Amino acid sequence: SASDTVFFGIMSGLELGTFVPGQRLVETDLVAHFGVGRNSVREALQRLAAEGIVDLQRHRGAVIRRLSLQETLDVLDVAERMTGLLARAATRGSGNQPQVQALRASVQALVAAEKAQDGETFSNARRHFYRTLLEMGDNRELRRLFPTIHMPIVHAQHRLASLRQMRLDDYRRIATAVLAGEPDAAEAAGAAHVKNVRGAILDRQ
């Protein structure tokens, strides 16, 4: 839908660095930028407010949220458990050859992007990795919570681009645990990643 292109565009842009925490969004700027109409912007903004990404303002506008430290830690608390469950559930597809091939391919692309120090392609291969994990588990409840898992504000505000070496290793451990098919070790590997992110953020303080 036209609404989706703004909804996912702002979330991907936050990760890519084209939108930032604290940014003021103007309805007409979003219409011109995404090439969609007012109703679709409004709807996308409503959905983004629903997900905790923006605060709606007067005159059809919005501000991308910045989180306090406590708010970040609270988000990571949920992301830890939900990423854990994403990996855990994906073990249901460990014998599905095409999905395994997709998962292995997504990992190769992460490794190549990390080496080339390319934030854009790394972010895109990251998204692909997560989506493959999602398709593998086929958990309808995770599908509906999926955006939380990505932590777009945390990514941006806490400069997760600078933690790419650690994150890649984490994603490799997730893949390896998922593909081995054992749910408990998969869950632990998914949760491990978020624990590392929390550790890095707290270490700066």
Side-chain angles (χ1 to χ4, degrees), residues 1-12 34 36-37 39-45 47-48 131 147:
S1 76
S3 173
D4 285 356
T5 80
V6 182
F7 181 78
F8 292 111
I10 286 165
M11 260 164 18
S12 57
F34 288 109
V36 304
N39 284 354
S40 302
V41 169
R42 288 180 197 164
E43 175 181 328
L45 287 175
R47 285 160 67 187
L48 283 167
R131 167 55 53 94

Side-chain angles (χ1 to χ4, degrees), residues 78-115:
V78 172
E80 185 176 333
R81 287 151 182 85
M82 299 295 103
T83 305
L85 188 47
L86 182 71
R88 182 188 189 85
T91 60
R92 293 169 74 270
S94 60
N96 185 299
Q97 263 176 79
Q99 286 174 344
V100 167
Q101 288 187 1
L103 192 75
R104 293 189 184 286
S106 71
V107 176
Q108 297 160 225
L110 288 158
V111 171
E114 191 282 324
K115 185 176 164 192

Side-chain angles (χ1 to χ4, degrees), residues 167-188:
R167 297 166 47 219
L168 170 67
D169 193 61
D170 291 353
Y171 299 145
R172 292 170 88 157
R173 294 159 168 274
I174 291 164
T176 297
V178 168
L179 293 180
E182 198 283 294
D184 288 347
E187 188 172 357

Side-chain angles (χ1 to χ4, degrees), residues 43-45 47-57 59-131:
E43 175 181 328
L45 287 175
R47 285 160 67 187
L48 283 167
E51 297 280 0
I53 305 308
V54 305
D55 293 335
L56 301 193
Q57 309 288 263
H59 321 275
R60 307 297 190 174
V63 176
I64 303 185
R65 288 190 68 233
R66 287 192 181 93
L67 307 183
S68 69
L69 183 49
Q70 182 59 56
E71 286 168 334
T72 298
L73 292 171
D74 285 354
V75 164
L76 293 165
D77 269 347
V78 172
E80 185 176 333
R81 287 151 182 85
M82 299 295 103
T83 305
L85 188 47
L86 182 71
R88 182 188 189 85
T91 60
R92 293 169 74 270
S94 60
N96 185 299
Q97 263 176 79
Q99 286 174 344
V100 167
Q101 288 187 1
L103 192 75
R104 293 189 184 286
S106 71
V107 176
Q108 297 160 225
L110 288 158
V111 171
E114 191 282 324
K115 185 176 164 192
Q117 283 171 49
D118 186 344
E120 181 166 0
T121 58
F122 188 83
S123 287
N124 301 336
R126 185 206 65 72
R127 210 165 289 278
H128 187 51
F129 179 61
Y130 275 65
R131 167 55 53 94

